[PDB]
Write a protein that binds this ligand. Sequence first.
Ligand code: VCA
Length: 133
Amino acid sequence: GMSNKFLGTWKLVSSENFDDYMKALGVGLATRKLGNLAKPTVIISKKGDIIPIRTESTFKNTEISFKLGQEFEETTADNRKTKSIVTLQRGSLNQVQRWDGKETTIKRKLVNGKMVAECKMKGVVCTRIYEKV
Ligand SMILES: CCCCCC/C=C\CCCCCCCCCC(=O)O
């Protein structure tokens, strides 16, 4: 299952290409400006076979909880209503969100103790790096 090394509180320390990623999602200008200024905290925990992931920022908070491989309803930070699935692939926690015939993937993996999130939407790739705190 998911490595226990994922468990904990993570703080964003770097974000590359988030603006174009948000544009690809259809996020408006004012929202993107605040999104680009946000430095969220991401909290990953485990309750039995349920995995909650909570995101906290001054602008927006989100929370999802899921079992691996089981589709669930998700409300995203930009208020998309998606059907989502999280899978585990070579130690990577891979989230796919589907809505209105579109899809985006968020892949989270551990790299030298940091958590690296890769966000992909229509060929646009955003990389966000988190430190454990
Ligand atoms: C996660 C960002 C929370 C608040 C800032 C975002 C503002 C508007 C929503 C547009 C971004 C929606 C996609 C967020 C993907 C975050 C992936 C991650 O770093 O965990």
